[PDB]
Design a protein around this ligand. Structure first.
Ligand SMILES: CCCCCCCCCCCCCCCCCC(=O)OC[C@H](COP(=O)([O-])OCC(O)COP(=O)([O-])OC[C@@H](COC(=O)CCCCCCCCCCCCCCCCC)OC(=O)CCCCCCCCCCCCCCCCC)OC(=O)CCCCCCCCCCCCCCCCC
Ligand SMILES: CCCCCCCCCCCCCCCCCC(=O)OC[C@H](COP(=O)([O-])OCC[N+](C)(C)C)OC(=O)CCCCCCCCCCCCCCCCC
Ligand SMILES: CCCCCCCCCCCCCCCCCC(=O)OC[C@H](COP(=O)(O)OCCN)OC(=O)CCCCCCCCCCCCCCCCC
Ligand SMILES: CCCCCCCCCCCCCCCCCC(=O)OC[C@H](COP(=O)(O)OCCN)OC(=O)CCCCCCCCCCCCCCCCC
Ligand SMILES: CCCCCCCCCCCCCCCCCC(=O)OC[C@H](COP(=O)(O)OCCN)OC(=O)CCCCCCCCCCCCCCCCC
Ligand SMILES: Nc1ncnc2c1ncn2[C@@H]1O[C@H](COP(=O)(O)OP(=O)(O)O)[C@@H](O)[C@H]1O
Ligand code: FES
Lengths: 96, 62, 108, 146, 186, 26, 223, 70, 505
């Protein structure tokens, strides 16, 4: 069974208390005692459960930087393979 | 200390909410203290006994 | 047919940790389904030699003699490879024990 | 069972299965048992003499007490829990398992055609007021005295 | 009526019984039940061949149904043990066999029809299911504890167990404030 | 016309398994 | 950086434990060599105050704690708070906080549950001017100020009792239930009883004050 | 078929209409066209074609088919 | 432009990755043993188990990452090494390069590290399959059996030493060392009651195979008083000894890599074992038999006809694929698929050191990932519906559709669409077999890729489609992120390893 704590310290859980009001008055001689906490979860109202709610740029930036590094590294490797300091660009290129 | 502080000037709902919040904060502090004590209990044996174990294994094998 | 009264069920080791995924909601099982689940594992033959005629004797014999048929076909095609100088069915030894892409270096 | 909300609990007296016993010394005994239990457990809880029970019922996974007997079971291990069951109940018990018969016919003391290993019996409703006899069972090993 | 004539490994005798009578075992039916069921099957087949047919003739259809009605009215008043009734049963079972079509039109309202069970209908159990509280409100307490029971957390949908120790904000002040205050007091 | 109720759950009748599933019909 | 202090504290504690054990073993060996049997005395091992490693019970000098009682773990007690004879407060799991001018009866057992849901404190909290009768059992509950609980009452986890409410003797408050302010409740499936009056509240307060005074007198006589 | 309720928790696609489908169509179509343009631009490097009308392949030219010197 | 720096990078990475893993294991073990007295879970929030879990996961991942870079180094190294001897055409010069030893750590077991392509493929498979299996064992580990969180790190260390030695004795010892952890996992972690006898079957068959291999190893060691694969180049075995050795090693390694007459243990063990260990057993453990056999097959000159071994392997394929129709348990069906493709791979090593080994090497990894995916899908179904029998669960689509989509895509990949490595391995092996034996190739192709495929597809399609009407109050939710990412990674690895360097294979 799970044994982790739920009252976290990093942030406060988003919740509302207007839903599920307690009775607290006008009790009869047969009904049960009212509940105590009654708070319910509150969603950011811009959340879509059917897709990733990802709004960052880190993944795209990392992939783009990796691809650019791959390109420049290949350029350096090709220049080194031909025994040149930089690629010698021909004046005309043809279909392979 | 919220519990020891007088709360008769509040409504019962405010008093119980204040007590609950104070209890939750103190619970979090106690949890942090216990967790760091147990972390130290984990950390000490590694520093004390990692080198003798490696010495034993190295002397056995090579 | 009346539902089975005695049949093999599921069993778990002592002090087993239950699986509690998706809220841990387990339903009652169907006796016929559980009976089918555990029937084949516990099925056994009744008398010696019952297998040969169980089903089709000719088909069972053919299944029994399959490895010999494969060996004979391989022998015939090895005859075909021998006279055409094709790849024979032998453990070829042309690398003198040197492995496929193996580092062969020295120290000192 | 079958209960409805607000119902009261049943009485243990109405759920008792009665076993009538002739001792090794010719005296009569009355024993209380319950359904879903083995005869050996009831006999040992009621402290009935004449049974040695060297192996204490056998293994714990593939036992003889499960209603369909599992094929890869090992069966009884000591054959020292023998009882003699009277004709109607013994006839209702049915034919013996081959492993149980092998252990029964191999005992050092004489047996009968009504012999039956106690740990291989699961107590049922129809076993109420069943008559059995327990002559003394043989000893096997050194630790039996300890 | 379930139209599982061909989707079960039936013999012809079972299929013929199901076509002539609404059961595989016509021996458990009364005399009147058998007569009425055979009459209904015969009329259904004649309609399927002489009204919804290829080149349908209404006059011939009326003649045939009149003759069949006369014959079945004779059949009803006979006795079950009579051989003439058995001959009538044999004749109309042969008629059902002779008009048998491997391409019968099956009404779409029948249980084993061609377009039956094309959609999975969700019951109220699935409609009211919401583990996380986006569509239906979810208590932070996760349940309402009934009396005569302890208060226990619900089993989560994902029991991963791949969790760390409790995380705290950096530079979290966690001194024993109560103990320090009391010790200062005395 | 007529206010039809929702699609009935009888559209998917539940099977009851009146007979045993033979291992020779696997 | 505080991990270093925790490591040093644990090392010091372990060295002290080693030294104490070695001393006791040497004393027992001296017993034997001397033909002494004093160290074979089977005296009671019960401790009035039992602190878990870093959880030490903390209370004022004005608190009365019976020598029969047992406070274990993190137990915090306010001023002029009395614990009766044979009571047990186990805060090994989570702390137990008791306010001031609070009376705890003789056979009261207070403990806490392992875990609870979000937003529910798992510790036990008892306010000020609170009377708890003898034989009560309390588990992870919040009791506000000026609350009286009768004898042989059971209060379960997640229960909240608001200020000024009264619980009749021989009752049970089900887990996770709220009992509103200024009301009397009775029964094992506890049920509502008519709202309290001024005279009843005054009598309850006077009885609590008299019990506190009697406890203080008993503490003074004991010393 | 007559419409029937679908549970909210299920991420299934029965009778779904997205009110913002025009912008989503735009933002799925145009980048797709750009990606396909880049793929086609890369692939035209390795595309062959027979000589046009009125042209002949000189057998002694370098582009003409070749044999192997053993 | 290849120089000494790449050589020393490769060697240092090979040795230091092992020492990284070993120091992780030692530190975690010391923390586990000295933190508490009993060394069982404390069942609270601050249990050491938590830390241990992370540690183990951490290490494997990190080691795998290092391994990847390490692996790449080897490739380049090996490539250039060949070149350094291919272009040495002058009769006066010869490649005479002698390396030094690292001054930080000692050579484990006083041996010089040597590595090959297939050994590093095996190590990579160990890393990935161990990661997947340990991810699929969180729920099984609890109070009093958390220690078995350490099993996969031990497996990694043993397989590392197995693949990085030229000592035939240490080779055999590392092969033998793998049994105790496996038996312990099946015995103490499996929830099913029938797993107690299944572990005994596993032990007895695997140990009979190990005994045969031991007899062959003792033969080789006693006849040639040496422990190096190199020295076998200077000693010749007669016809009788060669025949005895080849028969012994073939039968012994076919006990573990299940040949036709010996797969009862594998079927029982997969049916009864926990899902994570089943993933490890099909994905990686059986491959350990292919490696060792290959080595002992390549170091000896055998002058026998391989027709008997080829026939045994083909009989295994035919027998396993003909039995797929009559399976209702999905796990047993996956086990039979494992048997057929393991026998197909084992066939490729029946021609010695010829080019047939490349297809087998690739198809070993292909089967590793396919079997891991199939057993993970079976585990997901079992944890969702509490059953893995076709008569009890169907209509996995229309409720939790992601699992059904995964099943269908797994079926496609198993069928072998020409875009993946399954098609490549089939092409290799079938081209070679068609040249070696046309009618045999056609028979094997028809039996494996039609009849077995039809049975597999029937049993899997029937579970995916239908109407889940029975118990709507207990119907489960769809896949979690962990399962989705694991399945996606299996698919991605197949598709992208279809693009590996062609210098190898
Ligand atoms: C979940 C449950 C899953 C259950 C699965 C069960 C199995 C059955 C299947 C079920 C399927 C349905 C379930 C999922 C449904 C769902 O969630 O849908 C919504 C979901 C969108 O979710 P969302 O809410 O919008 O959140 C997205 C974020 O907001 C976006 O924010 P952002 O702007 O930050 O975007 C981030 C994005 C930014 O990056 C990108 O978009 C580019 C990614 C490049 C990948 C390759 C990088 C290099 C490494 C690989 C080797 C390359 C070698 C050279 C190749 C040449 O990066 C990533 O997402 C990282 C992913 C890749 C990590 C690297 C490792 C894998 C590499 C291969 C990835 C392949 C992806 C799938 C392709 C499928 C078709 C083939 O998906 C979609 O709507 C479409 C997904 C696929 C989009 C592909 C777009 C094209 C990419 C082309 C790249 C290459 C171009 C080449 C040009 C020509 C070169 C010659
Ligand atoms: C690198 C290059 C790679 C090129 C090939 C890429 C192949 C991608 C295949 C598609 C992956 C996602 C499939 C999602 C299906 C789906 O949602 O179905 C909904 C329905 C279920 O609907 P639902 O409503 O339950 O679920 C929708 C919500 N989700 C999916 C998020 C749970 O699924 C099915 O009906 C199951 C069967 C799907 C079969 C799909 C048809 C075949 C697809 C072939 C693709 C390629 C064709 C062209 C050839 C290309 C050759 C290069
Ligand atoms: C892997 C173990 C370390 C994991 C990373 C780490 O230290 O995380 C921080 C954690 C405290 O967590 P927290 O402060 O809540 O979050 C901050 C997030 N960095 O820090 C901790 O929990 C600290 C304790 C980590 C676990 C025990 C220490 C493991 C390694 C000990 C090595 C000791 C040296 C051994 C070799 C030399 C011996 C002489
Ligand atoms: C052959 C006969 C085809 C007949 C098609 C008739 C339907 C049709 O396409 O109508 C045009 C459509 C009208 O859109 P409308 O009805 O206004 O939308 C209501 C939703 N708000 O309007 C459109 O389709 C255009 C609306 C914008 C579409 C997306 C634009 C961005 C992507 C362009 C991709 C190219
Ligand atoms: C949880 C914590 C992390 C666990 C995983 C990573 C562990 C890395 C090593 C941590 C320290 C281990 C100490 C073991 C005991 C010892 O004294 O080791 C010394 C040993 C060198 O041996 P030495 O005693 O000098 O004698 C010469 C012959 N060996 O070894 C050394 O001097 C250290 C170098 C060993 C070889 C490399 C091992 C991997 C290094 C990774 C570096 C980055 C790690 C970052 C944290 C993770
Ligand atoms: N498990 C089975 N084994 C053999 N035959 C079966 C099995 N299940 C169904 N059948 C055949 O298919 C038919 C199914 O009919 P059924 O759906 O039970 O009709 P009903 O619901 O009216 O009884 C039966 O008549 C039987 O002959
Ligand atoms: S007690 Fe041993 S056989 Fe019954």
């Amino acid at each position: 069974r799970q044994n982790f704590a739920k009252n976290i310290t990093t942030t406060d859980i988003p919740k509302d208390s207007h839903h599920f009001a307690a009775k607290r008055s006008g009790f009869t001689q047969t009904e049960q005692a009212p509940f105590a906490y009654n708070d319910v979860y509150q969603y950011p109202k811009d959340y879509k459960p059917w897709n990733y709610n990802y709004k960052g740029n880190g993944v795209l930036l990392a992939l783009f930087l990796g691809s650019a590094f791959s390109l420049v590294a290949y350029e350096r490797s090709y220049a080194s393979k031909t025994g040149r300091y930089q690629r010698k660009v021909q004046q005309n290129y043809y279909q392979i | 200390n919220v519990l020891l502080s007088n709360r008769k000037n509040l409504t019962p709902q405010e008093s119980v909410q204040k007590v609950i919040n104070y209890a939750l904060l103190q619970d979090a502090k106690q949890r942090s203290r216990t967790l760091r004590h147990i972390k130290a209990s984990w950390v000490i044996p590694a520093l004390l006994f990692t080198y003798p174990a490696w010495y034993l294994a190295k002397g056995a094998v090579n | 047919a009346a539902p089975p009264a005695a049949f093999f069920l599921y069993f778990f080791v002592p002090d087993n940790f239950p699986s509690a995924q998706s809220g841990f909601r387990t339903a009652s099982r169907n006796p016929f389904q559980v009976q089918f689940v555990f029937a084949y594992d516990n099925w056994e033959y009744k008398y010696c030699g019952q297998w040969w005629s169980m089903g089709s004797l000719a088909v069972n014999v053919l299944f029994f003699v399959v490895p010999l048929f494969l060996w004979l076909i391989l022998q015939t095609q090895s005859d075909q490879s021998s006279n055409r100088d094709d790849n024979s069915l032998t453990f070829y030894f042309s690398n003198a024990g040197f492995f496929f892409f193996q580092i062969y270096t020295n120290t000192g | 069972h079958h209960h409805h909300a607000g119902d009261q609990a049943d009485r243990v007296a109405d759920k008792i299965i009665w076993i009538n016993i002739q001792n090794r010394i010719g005296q009569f005994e009355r024993i209380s048992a319950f359904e879903g239990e083995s005869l050996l457990e009831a006999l040992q809880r009621n402290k009935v003499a004449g049974i040695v029970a060297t192996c204490e019922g056998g293994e714990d996974i593939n036992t003889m007490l499960e209603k369909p007997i599992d094929p890869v079971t090992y069966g009884p291990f000591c054959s020292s829990c023998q009882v003699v069951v009277s004709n109607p109940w013994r006839n209702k018990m049915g034919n013996l398992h081959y492993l149980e018969e092998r252990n029964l016919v191999r005992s050092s003391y004489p047996t009968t055609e009504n012999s039956r290993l106690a740990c291989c019996i699961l107590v049922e409703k129809w076993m109420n007021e069943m008559i059995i006899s327990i002559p003394q069972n043989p000893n096997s090993v050194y630790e039996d005295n300890m | 009526s379930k139209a599982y004539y061909f989707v079960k490994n039936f013999s012809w005798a079972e299929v013929s019984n199901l076509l002539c009578y609404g059961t595989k075992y016509p021996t458990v039916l009364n005399h009147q039940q058998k007569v009425t069921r055979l009459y209904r099957a015969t009329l259904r087949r004649v309609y399927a061949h002489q009204v919804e047919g290829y080149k349908t003739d209404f006059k011939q259809y009326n003649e045939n149904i009149t003759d069949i009605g006369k014959d079945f009215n004779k059949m009803l008043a006979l006795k079950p043990e009579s051989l003439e009734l058995q001959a009538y049963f044999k004749k109309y079972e042969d008629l059902q066999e002779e008009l048998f079509d491997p391409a019968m039109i099956i009404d779409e309202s029948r249980p084993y029809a061609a377009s039956s069970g094309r959609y999975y209908i969700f019951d109220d159990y699935l409609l009211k299911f919401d583990p996380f509280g986006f569509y239906s409100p979810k208590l932070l307490s996760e349940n309402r504890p009934e009396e005569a029971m302890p208060f226990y957390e619900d089993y989560p949908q994902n029991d991963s167990h791949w969790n760390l120790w409790e995380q705290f904000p950096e530079d979290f002040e966690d001194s024993n404030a109560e103990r320090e205050a009391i010790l200062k007091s005395n | 016309g007529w206010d039809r109720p929702d699609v009935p759950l009888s559209f998917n009748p539940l099977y009851v398994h009146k007979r045993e599933l033979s291992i020779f019909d696997t | 950086m505080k991990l270093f202090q925790a490591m040093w504290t644990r090392t010091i504690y372990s060295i002290g434990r080693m030294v104490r054990e070695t001393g006791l073993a040497l004393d027992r060996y001296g017993c034997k060599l001397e033909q002494d049997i004093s160290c074979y005395e089977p005296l009671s091992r019960h401790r009035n105050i039992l602190p878990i490693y870093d959880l030490v019970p903390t209370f004022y000098h004005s608190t009365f704690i019976a020598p029969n009682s047992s406070l274990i773990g993190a137990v915090y007690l306010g001023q002029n708070t009395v614990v009766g004879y044979g009571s047990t407060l186990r805060g090994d799991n989570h702390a137990i906080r008791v306010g001031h001018n609070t009376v705890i009866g003789d056979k009261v057992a207070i403990s806490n549950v392992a875990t609870l849901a979000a937003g529910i404190p798992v510790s036990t909290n008892i306010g000020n001017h609170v009377n708890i009768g003898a034989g009560c059992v309390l588990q992870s509950c919040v009791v506000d100020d000026n609350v009286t609980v009768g004898h042989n009452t059971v209060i379960l986890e997640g229960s909240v009792l608001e200020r000024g409410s009264v619980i009749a003797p021989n009752s049970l408050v089900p887990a996770g239930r709220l009992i509103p302010s200024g009301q009397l409740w009775a029964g094992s499936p506890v049920r509502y009883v008519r709202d309290l009056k001024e005279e009843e509240i005054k009598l309850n307060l006077e009885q609590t004050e008299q019990n506190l005074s009697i406890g203080k007198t008993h503490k003074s006589s004991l010393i | 078929f007559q419409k029937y309720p679908i549970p909210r928790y299920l991420h299934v696609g029965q009778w779904i209409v997205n009110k913002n489908w025009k912008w989503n169509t735009f933002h799925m179509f145009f980048p797709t066209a750009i990606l396909c343009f880049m793929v086609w631009r890369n692939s035209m490097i390795s595309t062959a074609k027979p000589p046009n009308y009125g042209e002949y392949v000189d057998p002694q030219s370098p582009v003409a088919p070749k044999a192997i010197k053993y | 432009m290849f120089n000494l720096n790449t050589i020393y990078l490769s060697r240092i990475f090979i040795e230091f990755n092992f020492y990284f893993l070993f120091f992780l294991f030692l530190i975690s073990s010391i923390i586990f043993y000295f933190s508490k007295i009993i060394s069982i879970q404390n069942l609270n929030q601050n249990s050491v188990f938590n830390f241990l879990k992370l540690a183990n996961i951490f290490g494997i991942l990190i080691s795998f990452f290092i391994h990847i870079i390490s692996f790449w180094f080897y490739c380049i190294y090996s490539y250039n090494l060949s070149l350094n001897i291919f272009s040495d055409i002058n009769l006066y010069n010869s490649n005479s390069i002698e390396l030094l030893n690292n001054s930080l750590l000692p050579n484990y077991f006083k041996s010089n590290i040597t590595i090959d392509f297939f050994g590093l493929i095996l190590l990579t498979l160990a890393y990935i399959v161990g990661f997947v299996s340990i991810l699929a064992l969180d729920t099984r580990l609890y109070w009093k059996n958390i220690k078995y969180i350490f099993s996969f790190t031990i497996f990694l260390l043993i397989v590392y030493v197995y693949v990085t030695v030229s000592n035939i004795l240490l080779f055999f010892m590392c092969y033998e060392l793998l049994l105790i952890p496996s038996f312990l996992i099946v015995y103490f972690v499996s929830p099913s009651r029938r797993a107690i006898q299944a572990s005994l079957y596993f032990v007895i068959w695997t140990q009979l195979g190990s005994l045969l291999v031991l007899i062959a190893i003792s033969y080789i060691i006693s006849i040639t008083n040496t422990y190096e694969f190199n020295d076998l180049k200077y000693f010749n075995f007669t016809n009788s000894e060669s025949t005895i050795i080849i028969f012994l090693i073939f039968l012994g390694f076919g006990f573990k890599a299940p040949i036709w007459p010996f797969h009862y243990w594998l079927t029982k063990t997969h049916v009864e074992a926990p899902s994570g260990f089943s993933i490890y057993l099909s994905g990686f453990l059986v491959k350990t038999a292919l490696y060792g056999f290959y080595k002992f097959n390549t170091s000896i000159f055998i002058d026998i006809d391989s027709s008997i071994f080829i026939a045994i392997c083909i009989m295994g394929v035919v027998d396993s694929s003909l039995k797929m129709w009559g399976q209702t348990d999905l796990k047993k069906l996956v086990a039979y698929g494992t048997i057929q493709e393991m026998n197909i791979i084992y066939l490729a090593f029946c021609w010695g050191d010829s080019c047939a080994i490349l297809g087998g090497i690739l198809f070993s990894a292909t089967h590793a990932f396919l079997s891991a995916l199939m057993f993970f899908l079976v585990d997901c179904i079992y944890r969702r519906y509490h059953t893995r029998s076709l008569v009890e669960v169907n209509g996995i689509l229309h409720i939790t559709p992601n699992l059904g989509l995964s099943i269908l895509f797994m079926l496609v990949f198993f069928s072998g669409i020409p875009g993946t490595i399954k098609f490549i391995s089939e092409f290799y092996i079938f081209s070679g077999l068609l040249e070696a034996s046309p009618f045999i190739c056609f028979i094997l192709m028809l039996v494996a890729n039609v009849l077995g495929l039809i049975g597999f597809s029937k049993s899997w399609f029937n579970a995916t489609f239908g109407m889940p009407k029975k118990n709507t109050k207990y119907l489960p939710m769809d896949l979690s992120f962990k399962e989705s990412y694991i399945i996606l990674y299996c698919f991605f690895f197949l598709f992208i390893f279809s693009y590996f360097s062609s210098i190898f294979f």
